[PDB]
């Protein structure tokens, strides 16, 4: 799994750029910032642009990491107690801006109106409010699920990993693959604002049976969420093929650490991911990641977006 | 319809950039050129990048034009007699690179495997032996208006048409949808899966399981004849996919027929002539505008109208099932 390690010069250039941009723009509430994102991303070090472009076009590996960013721990300040009711943007705005630049190299940032107050950049940190370990494609059910996810580690003092797993095709029979490509599986979900919520629930959600594998039969994409996937009892071929796919993905799961200054890129068509339980201290020093969802085609989701301009679905 | 007119300063900067890149890279055969496109595009004048970005994000107007480029006629040379057998890249490589840069600002350039040797930038100019064809290489024949590849799930999202020369100012036709001109009842019908849109012949699968799989989805469409909508996206400002020649409104569906005819009349009456004169680059949103071409008499002497064309996809990976490799940008 390729990775790119920033030189100190690159790290400084990225840090300086993100500080400049944070001073120049108000928040993501600035439509001008969202307009400017791809042009601003072209001010990133050229090696970093080239690396991510190669990852996107290769369409081979399920994830990659850019390591060695300078995330100023004093400026970022203590890990918050909650995201809810927290003023936005905080002193960590430069790091959020970094992820938005990265999202513009891969596609377009977007979000979910019902998640974390509709902020485009989500927070991942412990909130004081037996654990099965699980993994999944993000929003496997949804036709407009993320194409990529970007996870930036602001801090990770105990080196808590993320789980990531890809599909090793060689472990699967040709027959099971063909079945997995057929529409034989059910994948379940997780004011005119009130009218839209009900429209989204109806409109698509009550979709038909669908495939788990798609794209090239030689190197398939996947949408695999075991918890929400079910197979009609009578369809024994589809149950068998599903069991086989689960076992291959489950057995291939890896733990990938995103340490302070790492940005982890996950291809949501080629990899599943999960989180791992960990003991927090709840004292403002805990692990803190930021998360941006990326779509390759913002227009495809128009029917679920309140306006042409909004990047929020729902 | 918004447009952008280059100052001479901007036109000079664009021309020098395209000549610089033409010298620096070999051909579009260079995978490194295709990798670098969006980063290279950020070297275009800021005003141009901002204008196209606003166009793309506004998702409102169905076409736009950037006017006043400097396309050096002495360097470009005579309009070829055929696209086959030309030295590649040609002396117009800087203008091909320009359209490729513009394509990278909108999405990804892509092509069709069986079309013009799989070139990502196509030629449009008259070819004598094609005089009696309704193709891009035609002239005498009326190309009536349509959405490009209306039936195809992986049809172009945008088209880019660059006019290297157009001495007799022959127009392109472009038409959008004025929604206020349709009844709410007709719009609802148009959004429902009530219409059959047939594939163009060039897409028909009519040797290997790997090959068969590349056409299985289109074959299924031919076999199952699914009905579908003509309008989609937001009901207040919809996308459309309208190719009248390939659309069948089922005989029994009176409401569908009524709503189709109303849609056809609105689009047909709103058609406008857009001239893409020498130095103009026309951008068409293939979800919001239909386009066609007007007949004209060619001279076949190296002085004819010559356009370049690039198809743009917002999501290259969506079409993977119809692409031979992960790397290829060619469908089929």
UniProtKB/TrEMBL annotation, chain B:
EC number(s) given by UniProt: 1.14.11.41
Residues noted as binding 2-oxoglutarate 2 in the record, renumbered to the chain: 172, 293, 305, 309
Isomerase keyword on record: no
One Pfam family, short name: TauD
Binding site for Fe cation: 146, 148, 291
Residues involved in succinate binding: 172, 305, 309
A GO MF label: 2-oxoglutarate, L-arginine oxygenase (succinate-forming) activity
Classification via InterPro entries: Alpha-KG_dependent_hydroxylase, Arginine_beta-hydroxylase, Clavaminate_syn-like, TauD-like_sf, TauD/TfdA-like
Residues binding 2-oxoglutarate 1, per UniProt: 172, 305, 309
Binding-site list for Fe(3+) 2: 149, 203
Chain ranges of the TauD/TfdA-like domain: 239-310
Amino acids binding Fe(3+) 1: 146, 148, 291
This protein's UniProt keywords: Iron, Metal-binding, Oxidoreductase
Protein name: Hydroxylase
Species the sequence originates in: Streptomyces lavendulae subsp. lavendulae
């Amino acid at each position: 799994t390729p990775s790119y390690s920033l030189t100190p010069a690159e790290a400084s250039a990225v840090a300086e750029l993100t500080l400049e941009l944070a001073a120049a723009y108000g928040s993501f509430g600035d439509p001008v910032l969202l307009r400017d994102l791809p042009r601003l991303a072209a001010r990133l070090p050229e090696g970093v642009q080239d690396f991510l472009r190669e990852f996107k076009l290769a369409d081979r590996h399920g994830h990659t990491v850019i390591r060695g960013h300078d995330f100023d721990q004093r400026r970022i300040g203590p890990t918050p107690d909650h995201w809810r009711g927290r003023v936005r943007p905080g002193p960590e705005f430069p790091e959020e801006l970094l992820l938005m630049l990265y999202s513009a190299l891969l596609g377009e940032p977007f979000g979910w109106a019902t998640q974390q107050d509709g902020h485009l950049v989500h927070d991942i940190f412990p909130i004081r409010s037996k654990q099965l370990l699980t993994w999944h494609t993000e929003d496997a059910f949804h036709p407009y699920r993320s194409d990529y996810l970007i996870l930036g580690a602001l801090r990770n003092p105990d080196h808590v990993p993320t789980t990531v797993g890809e599909l090793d095709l060689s472990s699967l029979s040709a027959e099971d693959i063909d079945v997995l490509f057929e529409p034989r599986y059910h994948i379940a979900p997780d004011e005119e604002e009130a009218a839209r919520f009900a429209t989204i629930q109806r409109m698509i959600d009550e979709r038909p049976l669908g495939p788990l594998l798609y794209g090239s039969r030689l190197d398939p994409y996947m949408r695999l969420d075991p918890y929400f996937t079910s197979v009609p009892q009578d369809d024994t071929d589809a149950r068998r093929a599903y069991d086989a796919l689960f076992k291959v993905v489950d057995s291939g799961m890896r733990e990938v650490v995103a340490d302070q200054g790492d940005v982890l890129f996950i291809d949501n068509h080629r990899a599943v991911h999960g989180r791992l339980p960990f003991q927090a201290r709840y004292d403002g020093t805990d692990r803190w990641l930021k998360r941006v969802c990326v779509t390759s085609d913002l227009r495809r989701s128009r029917e679920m977006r309140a306006t042409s301009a909004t990047r929020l679905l729902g």
